[PDB]
Design a protein around this ligand. Structure first.
Ligand code: 5GP
Ligand code: 5GP
Lengths: 173, 176
């Protein structure tokens, strides 16, 4: 897939960041190359349409690298984007979950029964995405799927999200 | 302007957040309404094309709510987006700049831009101008040329515009 290649070739890997032995996958070059960013959004949108058809009501973007992809992905799908933030940031009534960071969402972000796909840049342990799913569940939203550009498969984040489906463009050990 | 109205109607105000006496302007509903979001990006893009023609090399988006607009704006203009992040998040060699929020620090990769490259900075809202000023400083230290800073909202009583001068500033909407 030449589109996927446009994305993969713009992932930059930094050894020993932030700790010795870890390899950080830097997605910033994807954003800097407009053809790469377009390919990433296109591939995610095509997957989501092919999997869910018209069932998705909103994209939920995770603070803050999910914010980079969520709105463009939503726009490509003709959908709005709701925001899940680090705690203390959102005004008005909210719910929060601590996973030690805390996520937050406005109580009126979604109505009961609305269906959402959650997007972040990368899935590692799955802690962040798992917390997002729980928050959304407490609004009585249905999480159809979580998606990311990158998945670190040796950390088994996918298993953590089960039974909510997960999809990534690229996988690294 | 029907387009501008689509954006203004989707700004929500929260008095006494985060402190008593102020009014937080919430842009979240703009993102939730795809017509509103499209209008905001379109208005910003049209302004930038009308003001700079083809001279913009990159959009620089500010962590974290600038990230919501930066890539879509960049895409609309056919440009890439570079990131200015809260300190501690970026790999590789970086520069950072403090400003009062106590203090916060923004950071950029030393290799984000080459000397002479021309950039427009975007954030959701301009208040005191501290955040945008820090971004401008970082970019200047890379020897990039900051053509303009833009936002959806400007709180004019806080005089952030003057703080950025002589770098031009543009907002879609203004409140006291
Ligand atoms: N871009 C990038 N983000 C990472 C990396 N490791 C962790 N993250 C960030 O941390 C979260 C995923 O970590 P998790 O909660 O799944 O362990 C995501 O929000 C992601 O932005 C990495 O190697 N690259
Ligand atoms: N959406 C929103 N952001 C604000 C508000 N006040 C401060 N900010 C955030 O803080 C920064 C602007 O504050 P400044 O540094 O100009 O005083 C921006 O990054 C913006 O995201 C507000 O009322 N609404």
């Amino acid at each position: 897939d030449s589109e996927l290649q446009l994305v993969e070739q713009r992932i930059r890997s930094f050894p020993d960041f932030p700790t010795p032995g870890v390899v950080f996958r830097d997605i910033s070059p994807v954003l800097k190359d407009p053809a790469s960013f377009r390919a990433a959004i296109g591939l995610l949108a095509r997957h989501l349409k092919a999997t869910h058809g018209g069932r998705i009501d909103y994209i939920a973007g995770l603070d803050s690298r999910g914010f980079l992809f969520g709105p463009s992905l939503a726009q490509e799908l003709g959908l709005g984007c709701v925001l899940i933030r680090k705690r203390g940031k959102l005004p008005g009534p909210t719910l929060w979950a601590s996973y030690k960071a805390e996520l937050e969402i406005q109580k009126d972000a979604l109505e009961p029964g609305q269906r959402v796909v959650v997007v972040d840049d990368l899935l590692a342990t799955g802690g962040t995405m798992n917390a997002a799913c729980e928050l959304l569940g407490r609004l009585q939203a249905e999480v159809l799927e979580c998606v990311s550009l990158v998945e670190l498969t040796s950390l088994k984040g996918r298993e953590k999200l089960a039974p909510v489906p997960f999809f990534s463009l690229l996988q690294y050990e």
